[PDB]
Amino acid sequence: LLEAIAIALTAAHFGAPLLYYWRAKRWLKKPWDVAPDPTYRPRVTVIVPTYNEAPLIEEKLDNIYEQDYPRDKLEVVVVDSASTDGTPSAVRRWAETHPDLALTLVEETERRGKAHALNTALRHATGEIVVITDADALWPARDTLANAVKWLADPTVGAVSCVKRPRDFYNVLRVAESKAWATPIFHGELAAFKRELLERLGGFPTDVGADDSHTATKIAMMGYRAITPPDVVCVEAVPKRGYHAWRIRRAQHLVQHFAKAIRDGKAPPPFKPILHAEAYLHLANPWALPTAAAALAAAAAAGSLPAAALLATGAALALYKPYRTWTTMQAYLIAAAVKNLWDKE
Ligand SMILES: Nc1nc2c(ncn2[C@@H]2O[C@H](COP(=O)(O)OP(=O)(O)O[C@H]3O[C@H](CO)[C@@H](O)[C@H](O)[C@@H]3O)[C@@H](O)[C@H]2O)c(=O)[nH]1
Ligand SMILES: [Mn+2]
């Protein structure tokens, strides 16, 4: 009996994403319902929140300086949340050598988290477009910012983020959901919002971890569009040490985000399938996997040996990488739900 539910749960667990992926690939066929406008030239405020990133901060403001967006339409706000290792002290060094780039560095009381810093920065922002970008993120081309901005021209588009590149099943979901209506996941490498909507929201909330995705999703719910077009590209920043902990800090942010998002309001009809499927994939399906694993483990230790064959196959499939990064993602999600439940105390 426990092999029965193990294979049922395995079927349900792997079938949910594959069916969703097929519906995404049919969304991917339709043409964009909005167009980037290359002559659109709004005032743009780029906000870099920093706590202890000195090597990265000098590479980062180099990266923003090198953007080809008209410098009279651009300003940077760097927010240090009262960090120790003298990154503000590097920041005005870079500001000494680059005076023609409009810059305001703003220092905090002490660290109250990223969203709170973003709201402080927001009361300095003067642009029509507000771009959040993490300090460890580098834009690979001198037109990355301009490309995001072209996509913000349409009045229905409220937010744009990048696709990440060097299983790009992920990127398919991103731009398919983008074309359908909105994608509920944004990337901190580049998150661009129309400031009028941030003011209506108002600001970023301090209780969700995935600031970008939460704002993007709130803008989608408001009847605006939140998209990651394929030509707005950033390279993912990988931390190095503590990779699993970092990936689990991000799973936990996605789990908090989707948990709060589906307990609020009604999505525009084209968005409610998107929201519910991605909330399912982040909050439900991961549990099906290790429950099946344990039922097979019990059936193996006591009695049956088709069960133990299924687990041994499971390992032999741990050799090839797509299945590896899938089951490890499910692992991060389950760990995250656990740490989420026990952290609030
Ligand atoms: N001012 C300020 N800045 C902060 C703080 N914490 C982090 N930052 C800055 O925010 C960026 C990311 O900080 P991380 O600690 O590395 O966060 P993360 O794990 O990399 O995740 C980030 O991106 C995710 C989305 O890709 C988000 O889930 C998350 O909220 C954050 O933006 C960096 O530029 C960092 O200096 C803070 O408390 N105060
Ligand atoms: Mn980071």
Q: Distance of CA 103 to CAs 72, 92, 139, Å?
A: 12, 10, 19
Bond from prior residue into 265 cis (ω within 30 degrees of 0): no
Ligand 1 centroid to residue 166 C-alpha, Å = 21
Structure tokens at 34: 């909005």
For residue 271, what is the enclosing H or E element? none
Structure-block tokens of residue 27 = 């969304």
Instruction: Tell whether 80 is in a known binding site.
Output: no
> Do the annotations mark residue 51 as ligand-binding?
yes
Ligand in nearest proximity to the CA of 112: 1
Closest CA relative to residue 123, chosen from 203, 206, 205: 203
CB within 8 A of 25, min separation 6: which ones?
Answer: 172, 176
Task: Verify whether ligand 1 is closer than 6 Å to residue 205 (CB atom).
Answer: no
Contact (CB, 8 A) for 81 and 106: no
Q: Which residue from 330, 340, 344 is spatially nearest to 13, judged by alpha carbons?
A: 330
Dihedral sign computed on CA atoms, order 88, 93, 96, 99: negative
Tokens at 227, concatenated: 């998209």
The answer on whether 135 is annotated among ligand-binding residues is: yes
Task: Say if CB 57 and CB 87 are below 8 A apart.
Answer: yes
User: Which ligand has an atom closest to residue 56 CA?
Assistant: 1
Residue to mutate, 46, 47, 48, 51, ligand 1, most ligand atoms under 8 Å from C-beta: 51
Rounded CA gap, 79 and 201, in Å? 21
What number does the ligand 1 atom closest to the CA of 211 have?
30
Distance CA 61, CA 63 (A): 5
Q: From ligand 1's centre to the CA of 189, what distance in Å?
A: 10
Strand partners, 105: 78
If you measure from the C-alpha of residue 307 to the centroid of ligand 2, how many angstroms do you get, rounded to a whole number? 41
DSSP code for 236: P
**Distance between Cα 51 and ligand 1 center (Å):** 8
CB 112 within 8 A of CB 197: no
Kindly give the interhelix angle for 211-221 and 114-122, rounded to the nearest 10 degrees: 60
Report CA-CA distances (Å) from 91 to 60, 135, 220.
10, 12, 35
Instruction: Choose one of 83, 85, 104, 134 to mutate for the ligand 1 pocket test, by most ligand atoms within 8 angstroms of C-beta.
Output: 134
- DSSP assignments along 79-122, one per residue: EE-S-SS-HHHHHHHHHHH-TTSEEEEEE-SS---HHHHHHHHH
Would the CB of 278 count as within 6 Å of ligand 1? no
Residue 157 three-state SS: strand
Of 121, 114, 136, nearest to 198 by C-alpha is 121
Residue 178 counted as an annotated binding residue: no
Taking the centre of ligand 1 as the mean of its atom positions, its distance from the CA of residue 134, in whole angstroms, is: 6
CATH number of the domain that residue 132 is part of: 3.90.550.10
Beta-carbon neighbour count of residue 77 at 10 Å?
24
State the Cα–Cα distance between residues 54 and 56, nearest whole angstrom: 5
DSSP code per residue over 26-82:
HHTTSPPSS---TT----EEEEEEESS-HHHHHHHHHHHHT--S-GGGEEEEEEE-S
**Ligand 1 nearest atom to the CA of residue 134, by list position:** 34
Which atom of ligand 1 is closest in space to residue 50's alpha carbon?
36
Query: Which residue's CA is the nearest one to ligand 1's atom 32?
Result: 188
Q: Helix, strand, or coil here: 191?
A: strand
Cα-to-centroid distance, 70 and ligand 1 (Å): 27
- Tell me the ligand closest to 215's alpha carbon: 1
Instruction: Tell me, in angstroms, the distance from the centre of ligand 2 to residue 237's CA.
Output: 6
Query: What is the number of H-type helices and E-type strands within the chain?
Result: 13, 9
Domain that holds residue 250: 44-263
Q: Ligand nearest 205 Cα, by number?
A: 1
Largest CA distance in the chain: 75
User: For ligand 1, is residue 133 a contact (CB within 6 Å)?
Assistant: no
